[PDB]
């Protein structure tokens, strides 16, 4: 109940919402149907439209008007945005030459440059080039300020998850807005874009920027807008708030546009009907900039022009129906469209079984346009599993397609565009431009992820960010000033450096090796290798730091270095360099089943071969590949028990092809590569290193833990004219986190030769170095010649494998 018979007189667009049942006059009152009776008359004036004209100049103030052209309007802060142009002979902001903003040029009383975030729904990255002739204000922001060619949204590429990620710096699994529609089984409640459940604060986790600001004494209202307030009124409201007295004036403002998304769903991303919405958004940017110019704020405020996601061609004929795969379709609930989420229709149905649903949806049709996953099996780069609102069964939908439960859902529900797909898909990429005194001038920056922007907005406002998933400092290169200068994290565990401490006969591991193969010259040589004489070749960027408490040993060898965990009985990391000239060899016949005790490491802290013999499901692989040994003699080191890791035979197919074929291909293409590989344990799918007591699976009868994934980080010189091991400047990286699965059901073509499917798998599981850091508690690139912020940028890089 609202007592709507209070009044908005002197209260229009108040920033502090008032409490029920009192009537409201803030920018969200319409959403709650709680505005006072006179809100439209007083706060939504439209008389005489939005523009000054020659005849209005110097008019007697008429309080009925939408905006003013009387002489007093500048001091009232309520001129139409083109007032000075029409009436005072000024130019539009867009017609002024760009001039570098070296310092804030702000009116007296301004404590800091204000931040204005201008969010555009569905603004696909390629609009910035393709629409540039019809968007001159946006083109001036872009060309004169700091821009990226695109910005990567989060998955799913839907509105609410991305806008709330922009506000919090958090992945959707952590802030809790995991889709535009959600069911929370603990609350037993549902969230939808339409309706009121979404007003309940219990859905919205993390700390959005307006709360971060408010807590730290910086004034800031929410970034939401009632859809029915026209854009011209939103702009005039912002300009009015900027005219408040110093003690009352916010420091952060948000404008939101529902375009071009609204039209893009109707017409497709490049429908001829799309030109006019792009023109109208550009006109709104022009109103804002002219308005700022009038207030002498156009060289004071920092403006961010940012989108939530792009838009793809999608029509209802490209729909897959679950009723064509499942006999039991009425026993499931599907959240449909550009992603699928499946759960049981009834919690009382004891015959519901996820394994049978997954199997019925796996590789059933030749050109099947979706792929089912248990959520823990989704690519780790999506960070889309650790929330009870995310159903266990997920469908990754191909770009341009939908999935639905039954055909009647699609015709008893027009459209030509949609979004929501994998966030690496080119059509889903969106936009970032920063313009103002704190951003750089005429500067292009590489693409980056939208999770990084919260920290930068905190930096722009002098705020300490709440804990988030950005890597603070990784976007320092966007900024002229206010950079954040992080220190590297402190190493928590220092390594042991064991020498030869055990005799062969102390081992009873059930292993064998034909290595009894028969010199002062070359014996000192082998000793030096074990002491670390080649370490500068194979550990190019320092050893990784271990950021938690544990017991581990550094082991040196001719061809590779490793950090060996006495707790997990395997390396945490193994590092090796492969030059462009390196030669690939075979595992010799006499060494096929060779495993050798490591006399530096106790039998008690070693794996054993008998466990692998007994475990009929589990085999083993090696982290440093024997195929890339530098010599027949060095090859023996590759068969050390301390280089062994547990591997399902299905996974060994993947791993062997990567090691035998792809590493050398990369070294050939990149002029040498340095590779760091290792295991990952994430049994609770939280994206974070498991402790020993979280491990759900061991090699049968043993204490050897089974990794959930295997990673590799492959580094070389950005200037590929220099070899990876003699690189003078910036680095180039690609990484992956491959799921360690006992089948290749994910790869529908896995019956074919590995050259037809393995690299496709690896691309799907591409990762940032930062993702591996979270998953391992290791910190890489500790010893380089590069600035720490540059290294943070490198750790956030994702190699996406999309075309231009
Ligand atoms: C991305 O960045 C974020 C932000 O840094 C990272 O997330 C943090 O990760 C931490 C570890 O997972 C986690 O720390 C836990 O916090 C518990 C207190 O949590 C509440 O308070 C905080 C602070 O205000 C708040 O933010 C939380 O918000 C979550 O929960 C509400 C729902 O109530 C949601 O609205 C909100 O969206 C958010 O949900 C997300 O996080 C929770 C986990 O907290 C998930 O379950 C959700 O699915 C969702 O992802 C909370 O309101 C604290 O109690 C925990 O401590 C327990 O565990 C530690 C382990 O160190 C142990 O030492 C303690 O003893 C304790 O154990 C006891 O409880 C156990 C569980 O019941 C029990 O089993 C034991 O036996 C013990 O009794 C823990 O410290 C932190 O909350 C989140 N923060 C956020 C915002 O998500 C994230 O990791 C980053 N991602 C990557 C990939 O890097
Ligand atoms: O603006 C709209 C549509 N719209 C319109 N009217 C609304 C009225 C109320 C509320 N609620 C206020 C109380 N509320 C909260 O206070 C929670 C959010 C932060 C912590 C508590 C829960 C949410 C949300 C909306 C809303 O979405 N869409 C654009 C947009 C802009 C910024 C962001 Cl971040 C997002 Cl996700 C979406
Ligand atoms: Ca959107
Ligand atoms: Ca974990
Ligand atoms: Na076995
Ligand atoms: Na397969
Ligand atoms: Zn949309």
DSSP string, 5-60: TS--TT-TT-SSPPPTTB-B-STTTTTTT-B-TTHHHHHS--BT-S---GGGTTPP
> Which CATH number applies to 504-796: 3.40.50.300, 3.40.50.970, 3.40.570.10, 3.40.430.10?
3.40.570.10
Binding site annotation covers 693?
no
List phi, psi (to 5°) of 235.
-65, -45
Among 134, 123, 152, smallest CA distance to 280 is for 134
User: Which of 80, 782, 166 is closest to 490 using CA atoms?
Assistant: 782
- Relative to the alpha carbon of 314, which ligand is closest? 7
Which pair of tokens denotes residue 42?
């007083």
Phi, psi of 387 (to 5 degrees): -160, 135
Kindly identify the ligand whose nearest atom is closest to the C-alpha of 388.
1
The secondary structure element, H or E, covering residue 144 is helix 136-144
Q: Which residue has the tokens 């680095």?
A: 731
Taking alpha carbons only, the member of 106, 103, 74 closest to residue 90 is: 74
CB atoms under 10 Å from CB of 309, counted, come to: 33
- Residue 170 in contact with ligand 1 by CB distance below 6 A: yes
Residue 382 tokens, joined: 């999506």
Closest CA to 429 of 307, 282, 304, 267: 307
CA–CA separation, 488 and 662 (whole Å) = 32
- C-alpha separations of 399 from 149, 267, 339, 361 in Å: 21, 17, 10, 18
Please name which ligand lies nearest the alpha carbon of 165: 2
The total of other beta-carbon atoms located within 10 Å of residue 45's CB is 16
Contact (Cβ atoms closer than 8 angstroms) between residue 777 and residue 689: yes
H-state helical runs in 157-230: 159-168, 172-175, 209-215
For this PDB entry, the determination method is: X-ray
Enumerate residues 6+ apart whose C-beta is below 8 A from 212. Answer: 458, 463, 464, 465, 466
Classify residue 243 by burial, with Cβ atoms within 10 Å: 0-12, 13-18, 19+: middle
Q: What are residue 676's DSSP bridge partners?
A: 575, 713
Ligand 2 atom nearest the C-alpha of 166 is 34
CB pairs under 8 A, 24+ apart, for 722-727?
Answer: 722/671, 723/579, 723/580, 723/671, 723/672, 724/540, 724/577, 724/579, 724/667, 724/670, 724/671, 724/672, 724/673, 724/674, 725/537, 725/540, 725/577, 725/579, 725/672, 725/674
Residue 121 in contact with residue 392, Cβ under 8 Å?
A: no
455 Cβ below 6 A of ligand 1: no
| Separation between Cα atoms, residue 592 and residue 583, nearest integer Å | 19
Nearest to 181 by CA among 200, 167, 202, 197: 197
Contact 42, 9 (CB under 8 A): yes
**Do 625 and 638 contact (CB within 8 A), yes or no?**
yes
Residue 794 makes CB contacts below 8 A (sequence gap 6+) with: 730, 731, 733, 769, 781, 786
Candidate from 205, 215, 549, 680 with most ligand 1 atoms within 8 A of CB, to mutate: 205
Closest ligand 1 atom to the C-alpha of 202?
35
| Angstrom distances, CA of residue 753 to CA of 29, 651, 653, 760, 801 | 62, 14, 10, 12, 21
| Separation CA 751–CA 90 (nearest Å) | 71
**Ligand 1 touching residue 211 (CB < 6 A):** no
* 339-344 and 393-397 strand pairing: antiparallel
Chain length of the chain: 804
| Ligand 2 centroid – CA 223 distance (Å) | 7
User: Which residues 6+ apart lie within 8 Å of 120 measured at CB?
Assistant: 257, 259, 260, 281, 305, 306, 307, 308, 431
User: Which of 146, 157, 159, 800 is labelled catalytic?
Assistant: 159
- Rounded CA-CA distance 407/770 in Å is 42
Name which of 617, 534, 601 is nearest 565 in CA terms: 601
262 contact partners, CB below 8 Å, separation of at least 6: 121, 122, 277
For 245, how many CA atoms within 13 A lie in the half-sphere containing its CB? 2
The tokens describing 148, both together, are: 């990226």
CA dihedral defined by 340, 341, 345, 351, rounded to 10 degrees?
100
3-state secondary structure of 103: coil
185 within ligand 1 shell (Cβ under 6 A): no
The Å distance, Cα 613 to ligand 6 centre, comes to 26
Among protein residues, the one with the nearest Cα to ligand 2's atom 26 is 224
Flag whether 309 is marked binding: yes
If you measure from the C-alpha of residue 776 to the centroid of ligand 3, how many angstroms do you get, rounded to a whole number?
34
Hey, is 691 helix, strand or coil? Answer: coil
Is the separation of the CB atoms in 77 and 88 below 8 Å? Answer: no
Residue of minimum CA distance from atom 12 in ligand 1: 686
Q: Is 255 in the pocket of ligand 2 (CB under 6 A)?
A: no
For residue 353, cis peptide bond before it (omega within 30 degrees of 0): no
Q: Which helix (H) or strand (E) holds 136?
A: helix 136-144
Residue nearest to atom 2 of ligand 2 (CA): 224
- Rounded Cα distance between 606 and 568, Å, is 9
Q: Is 381 helix (H, G, I), strand (E, B) or coil?
A: helix
Residue 461 contacts residue 213 (beta carbons within 8 Å): yes
Would the CB of 687 count as within 6 Å of ligand 1?
A: yes
Buried b (16+ CB within 10 A) or exposed e, 715-732: bbbeeeeebbbebeeebb
Q: What tokens appear for 443 in the block? A: 């500067």
Using alpha carbons, list the distances in angstroms from residue 140 to 77, 285, 290, 302: 25, 11, 13, 14
**Beta carbons within 8 Å of 691's beta carbon, 6+ residues apart:** none
Rounded to the nearest angstrom, the distance between the alpha carbon of 203 and the centre of ligand 3 is 18
> How many Cα atoms sit within 13 Å of 193 on the Cβ side?
8
HSE-CB for 567 with a 13 A CA cutoff: 13
Q: How many CA atoms lie within 13 A of 524 on its CB side?
A: 2
**Nearest one of 161, 201, 154 to 181, comparing CA atoms:** 161
Instruction: Tell me how far the alpha carbon of residue 760 lies from the centroid of ligand 1, in angstroms.
Output: 35
Question: DSSP string covering 707-724, please?
Answer: PSEEEEEEEEESSTTS-G
In whole angstroms, what is the distance from residue 35 CA to residue 359 CA? Answer: 53
Q: Is 559 annotated as a binding residue?
A: no
Do the Cβ atoms of 627 and 659 come closer than 8 Å?
yes
- Cα–Cα dist 303/316, whole Å: 38
Residues with a beta carbon under 5 angstroms from ion ligand 4: 682, 684, 686, 688, 690
305: three-class secondary structure by DSSP: strand
3-state secondary structure of 340: strand
Whether ligand 2 lies within 6 angstroms of the CB of 28 is answered as yes
Distance CA 341, CA 361 (A): 13
Tokens of 672: 């040498």
Q: How far apart are CA 40 and CA 25, in angstroms?
A: 10
Residue nearest to atom 25 of ligand 2 (CA): 224
Q: Report the candidate in 761, 760, 755, 779 with the shortest Cα–Cα distance to residue 769.
A: 779
684 marked among binding-site residues? yes
Q: Cα–Cα distance between 191 and 668 in angstroms, integer? A: 51
- DSSP states of 729-775 as a string? S-EEEEEEEEE--SS-TT-TTTTS-GGGTHHHHHHHTEE-HHHHHHH
Give the integer Cα–Cα distance in Å for 333 and 349: 13
Q: How far is the CA of 677 from the centre of ligand 5 (A)?
A: 22
How far is residue 595's CA from residue 377's CA, in Å, rounded to a whole number? Answer: 31
Name the phi and psi angles at 56, rounded to 5.
Answer: -80, -20
For residue 21, whether the previous peptide bond is cis, meaning omega lies within 30 degrees of 0, is yes
The continuous run of DSSP H or E covering 564 comes out as strand 561-565
Say whether 159 is catalytic. yes
Strands (E) in 236-369, as ranges, are: 252-260, 302-307, 312-313, 319-321, 332-335, 339-344
Token pair in block for residue 112: 């800091």
Assess whether the C-beta atom of 167 lies below 6 angstroms from ligand 2.
yes
C-alpha to C-alpha distance for 223 and 253, rounded to whole angstroms? 7
- Give the CA distances from residue 421 to residues 157, 397, 427, in Å, rounded to whole numbers and listed in that order: 6, 7, 9
**Euclidean distance between CA atoms 574 and 624, whole angstroms:** 7
Residue 324 assigned as binding residue? no
Contact between residue 387 and residue 172 where contact means Cβ atoms under 8 Å apart: yes
Tell me the ligand closest to 418's alpha carbon. Answer: 7
Q: Is 159 annotated as a binding residue?
A: yes
- List the residue whose alpha carbon is closest to atom 29 of ligand 2: 224
Asked if the bond preceding 156 is cis, omega within 30° of 0, the reply is: yes
User: How do 432-435 and 417-418 pair as beta strands?
Assistant: unpaired
**CB 331, CB 353: distance < 8 Å:** no
Contacts of 22 (CB under 8 A, 6+ apart): 2, 3, 6
Residue 204 Cβ inside 6 Å of ligand 2? The answer reads: yes
User: What are the tokens at 670?
Assistant: 């990149």
**Integer angstrom CA distances of residue 466 from 209, 302, 321, 770, 771:** 9, 21, 43, 19, 20
Known binder of ligand: residue 749?
no
Q: In this structure, are residues 595 and 644 in contact, taking their beta carbons and an 8 Å threshold?
A: yes
Q: How far is Cα 422 from Cα 399, in angstroms, rounded to an integer?
A: 8
Asked whether residue 192 is marked as a ligand-binding residue, the answer is no
**CA 624, CA 622: separation in Å to the nearest integer?**
6
Question: What phi and psi values does residue 526 have, to the nearest 5 degrees?
Answer: -65, -35
Q: Cα separations (Å) of 98 from 135, 296, 442, 634?
A: 16, 16, 9, 62
Helix ranges (H only) for 464-618 are 520-530, 535-538, 609-614
622 SS3 class: strand
Q: Where are the alpha helices (DSSP H) in 307-411?
A: 354-361, 408-411
Q: Are 410 and 316 in contact (CB under 8 A)?
A: yes
Beta carbons within 8 Å of 128's beta carbon, 6+ residues apart: 135, 138, 139, 142, 147, 431
Show the tokens assigned to 523: 């014996």
Task: Work out which ligand 1 atom sits closest to the CA atom of 686.
Answer: 93
454 lines ligand 2 (CB under 6 A): no
């Amino acid at each position: 109940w609202t007592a709507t018979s209070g009044s908005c007189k002197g209260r229009c667009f108040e920033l502090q919402e008032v409490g029920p049942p009192d009537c409201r006059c803030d920018n969200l009152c319409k959403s709650y149907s709680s505005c006072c009776h006179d809100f439209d008359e007083l706060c939504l004036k439209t008389a005489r439209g939005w523009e000054c004209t020659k005849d209005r100049c110097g008019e007697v103030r008429n309080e009925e008007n939408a905006c003013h052209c009387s002489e007093d309007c500048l001091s009232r802060g309520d001129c139409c945005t083109n007032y000075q142009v029409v009436c005072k002979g000024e130019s539009h902001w867009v017609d002024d030459d760009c001039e570098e903003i070296k310092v804030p040029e702000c009116p007296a009383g301004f404590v800091r440059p204000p931040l204005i975030i201008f969010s555009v729904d569905g603004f696909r990255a390629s609009y910035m080039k393709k629409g540039s002739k019809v968007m001159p204000n946006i083109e001036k922001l872009r060309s004169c300020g700091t821009h990226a060619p695109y910005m990567r949204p989060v998955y799913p590429t839907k509105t609410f998850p991305n806008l709330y990620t922009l506000a919090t710096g958090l992945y959707p699994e952590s802030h809790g807005i995991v889709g535009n529609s959600m069911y929370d089984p603990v609350f037993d409640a549902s969230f939808h874009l339409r309706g009121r459940e979404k007003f309940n604060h219990r859905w919205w986790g993390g700390q959005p920027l307006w709360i971060t600001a408010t807590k730290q004494g910086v004034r800031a209202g929410t970034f939401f807008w009632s859809v029915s307030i026209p854009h011209e009124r939103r702009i005039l409201t912002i300009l009015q708030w900027l005219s408040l007295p110093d003690n009352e004036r916010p420091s952060v403002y948000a404008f939101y546009s529902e375009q071009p998304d609204f039209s893009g769903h109707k017409y497709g991303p490049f429908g001829p009907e799309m030109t006019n919405p792009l023109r109208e958004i550009d006109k709104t940017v022009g109103q804002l900039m002219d308005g700022l110019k009038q207030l002498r704020l156009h060289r004071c405020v920092n403006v961010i022009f940012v989108g939530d996601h792009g838009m793809e061609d999608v029509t209802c004929d490209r729909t897959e129906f679950l009723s064509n795969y499942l006999t039991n379709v009425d026993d499931i609930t599907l959240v449909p469209g550009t992603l699928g989420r499946i759960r049981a229709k009834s919690i009382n149905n004891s015959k519901y079984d996820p394994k049978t649903i997954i199997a019925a949806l796996t590789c059933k049709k030749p050109d099947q346009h979706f792929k089912p996953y248990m959520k823990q099996h989704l690519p780790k780069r999506l960070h889309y599993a650790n929330n009870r609102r995310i159903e266990d069964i997920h469908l990754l939908v191909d770009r341009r397609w939908h999935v639905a439960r039954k055909p009647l859902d699609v015709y008893k529900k027009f459209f030509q565009g949609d979004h929501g797909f994998d966030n690496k898909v080119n059509s889903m990429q969106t936009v970032f431009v920063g313009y103002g005194p704190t951003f750089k001038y005429r500067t292009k920056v590489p693409p980056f992820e939208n999770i990084e922007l919260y920290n930068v907005m905190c930096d722009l406002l002098g705020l300490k960010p709440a804990p988030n998933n950005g890597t603070h400092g990784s976007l320092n290169h966007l900024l002229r000033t206010n950079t954040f200068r992080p220190t590297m994290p402190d190493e928590v565990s220092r390594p042991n450096y064991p020498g030869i401490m055990y005799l062969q006969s102390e081992f009873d591991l059930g292993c064998t090796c034909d290595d009894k193969v028969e010199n002062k010259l070359e014996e000192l040589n082998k000793r030096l290798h074990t002491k670390g004489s080649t370490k500068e070749r194979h550990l190019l960027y320092g050893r990784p730091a271990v950021l938690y408490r544990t017991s581990y040993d550094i082991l040196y060898h001719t061809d590779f270095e490793s950090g060996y965990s006495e707790i997990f009985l395997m390396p945490l990391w193994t590092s090796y360099t492969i030059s462009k000239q390196a030669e690939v060899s075979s595992i010799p016949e006499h060494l096929t089943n060779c495993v050798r005790p490591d006399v530096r490491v106790s039998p008690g802290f070693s794996q054993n071969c008998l466990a692998y013999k007994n475990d009929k499901q589990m085999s083993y692989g090696f982290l440093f590949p024997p195929y890339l040994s530098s010599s027949p003699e060095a090859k023996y080191d590759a068969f050390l028990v301390t280089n062994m890791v547990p591997m399902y035979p299905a996974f060994k197919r993947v791993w062997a092809y990567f090691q035998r074929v792809l590493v050398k291909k990369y070294a050939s293409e990149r002029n040498g590569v340095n590779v760091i590989s290792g295991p990952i344990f994430d049994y609770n799918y939280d994206g974070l290193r498991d402790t020993e007591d979280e491990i759900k699976q061991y090699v049968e009868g043993s204490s050897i833990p089974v990794p959930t994934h295997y990673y590799s980080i492959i580094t070389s010189c950005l200037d590929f004219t220099q070899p990876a091991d003699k690189c003078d400047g910036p680095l180039s990286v690609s990484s992956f986190i491959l799921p360690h699965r006992p089948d290749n059901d994910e790869s529908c073509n896995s019956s074919e030769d590995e050259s037809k499917w393995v690299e496709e798998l690896m691309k799907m599981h591409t990762a940032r170095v930062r993702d591996i850091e979270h998953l391992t508690g290791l910190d890489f690139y500790r010893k380089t010649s590069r600035s720490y912020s540059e290294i943070l940028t490198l750790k956030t890089y994702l190699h996406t494998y999309e075309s231009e």
